[PDB]
Amino acid sequence: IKVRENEPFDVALRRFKRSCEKAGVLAEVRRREFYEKPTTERKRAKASAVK
Template identity: 65%
Template sequence: MTTIIPKLNEPLDVALRRFRRAIENTGLLKELRARMSYVKPTAERKRKKAAAFALHRGRVRECVALHLRLA
C-alpha cells in the first residue's frame, strides 16, 4: 500500500499531490482501471498493437524530421 508521511507544516493540497504522484508512479490506478471490466484477449492484443504502431509512427516521424533538418 502506498503511503506518504506529511512533512511538518505541509499544506494538505501539497501532501495530496505527492500522494497522487506516488500512486501514479506505482501504476496502481492504471491496473485498477484495467481490472474494472473484462477485456477479451483479442481486444487487448489489438489495443496493444495499435499503441505500438502509433508509437512507432511517431518515432519514424521524428527521425524523418531530424533527417530533413540535417540535410
C-alpha cells in the first residue's frame, strides 16, 4: 500500500522539467537520451520512470 510511512499522503511527484501541465513533453528522444546529462542516474538503467 502507497508509502507505508506516517500521514495519509501519498502526494503527486514530478521528476522532469517543462513536462507537466505546460511546455511538455519527452524532450529526451530523436535521438538525445543522454548518457551524461542526468549524471550517475543513467549508469543503473535506461528505463526508470515507467518501468
